[PDB]
């Protein structure tokens, strides 16, 4: 996977670390990734306890996956962003293994929104 | 390009400089700062130290580059590749 990182100000080595960490997420995505962008920003105010902000955006075959984190330095922000992206990709999977427990089962046991409605005759059963 | 009625444009500084330069038939390096001045057939032998943004690059005039500007021969941006 190819990632372009648009940092700002002073963050030496943040671009390379973010690139190498994010590029490892291609195998986790179950569909081809069309685009992947990362942005690193730092808060000017020293009063901020977590100044560094990292944002990511992945185009998973038309499905947009994004996350945003805060950290005290570039490495921690990148690692937390990787964790959040992994969780989002896990929740997006949508392949059969990810939607086999949600497909309605049985015949009369259990009901879901998309469950097949029961067929009813014209006359009351009696 | 500049309209023909106005004629070619040359700054007065280097104009008087080259007139006093060619009156005794000796051509030393002339240090200049008007990149916008056109080449006139009175420059054929004179060597110009035209500005670049950082320094002055020697420009030795010929018959070929008459009618251009001193600016085309002092390349400003430097690019070597990625």
């Amino acid at each position: 996977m190819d990632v372009d990182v648009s940092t700002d100000g002073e963050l030496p080595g943040a671009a390379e670390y973010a690139r190498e960490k994010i590029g490892r997420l291609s195998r986790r995505a179950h569909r081809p990734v069309l685009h992947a962008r990362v942005r690193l920003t730092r808060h000017g105010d020293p009063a901020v306890e977590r100044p560094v902000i990292a944002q990511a955006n992945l185009d998973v075959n038309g499905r947009q996956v994004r996350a945003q984190v805060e950290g005290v330095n570039a490495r921690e922000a990148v690692d937390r962003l990787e964790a959040r992206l992994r969780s989002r990709l896990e929740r997006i999977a949508e392949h059969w293994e990810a939607r086999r427990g949600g497909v309605p089962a049985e015949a009369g046991r259990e009901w879901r929104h998309e469950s097949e409605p029961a067929r009813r005759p014209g006359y009351f059963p009696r | 390009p500049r309209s023909l009625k106005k004629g070619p444009f040359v700054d007065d500084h280097l104009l008087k400089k080259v007139d006093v330069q060619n009156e005794k038939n000796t051509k030393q390096v002339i240090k200049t700062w008007s990149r916008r001045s056109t080449i006139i057939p009175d420059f054929i032998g004179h060597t110009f130290a035209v500005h670049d943004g950082r320094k002055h690059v020697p420009v030795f005039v010929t018959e070929a580059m008459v009618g251009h500007k001193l600016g085309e021969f002092a390349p400003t941006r430097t690019f070597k590749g990625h």
Partner: protein, 100 residues
């Protein structure tokens, strides 16, 4: 914007009225007709000797109070930011919000 630049704009205007009124306009009248002998006259060279600030081409319509150089309106001489605020307060006669 910056006080120095607000002032320098005015200084250009007084320079323009002093010089561009006749000096930087008679030379143009000389250069207009090809019949007029411009080449030996050096009306080009004479008009180069004049200060650059004589030329109105160096002028800039700034906001009359604010000094804002962009988003200017010639009817009011005011920035888009200031026009919006004074029209809302009913300061410019015969100006109101639109509907059609």
């Amino acid at each position: 914007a910056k006080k120095s630049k607000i002032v320098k704009n005015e200084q250009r205007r007084e320079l323009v009225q002093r010089y561009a009124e006749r000096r930087a306009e008679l030379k143009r009248t000389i250069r207009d007709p090809a019949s007029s002998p411009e080449r030996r006259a050096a009306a080009v060279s004479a008009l180069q000797r004049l200060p650059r600030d004589s030329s109105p081409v160096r002028l800039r319509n700034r906001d009359v109070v604010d000094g804002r150089p962009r988003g200017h309106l010639r009817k009011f001489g005011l920035s888009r930011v200031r026009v919006r605020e004074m029209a809302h307060r009913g300061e410019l006669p015969g100006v109101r919000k639109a509907s059609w």
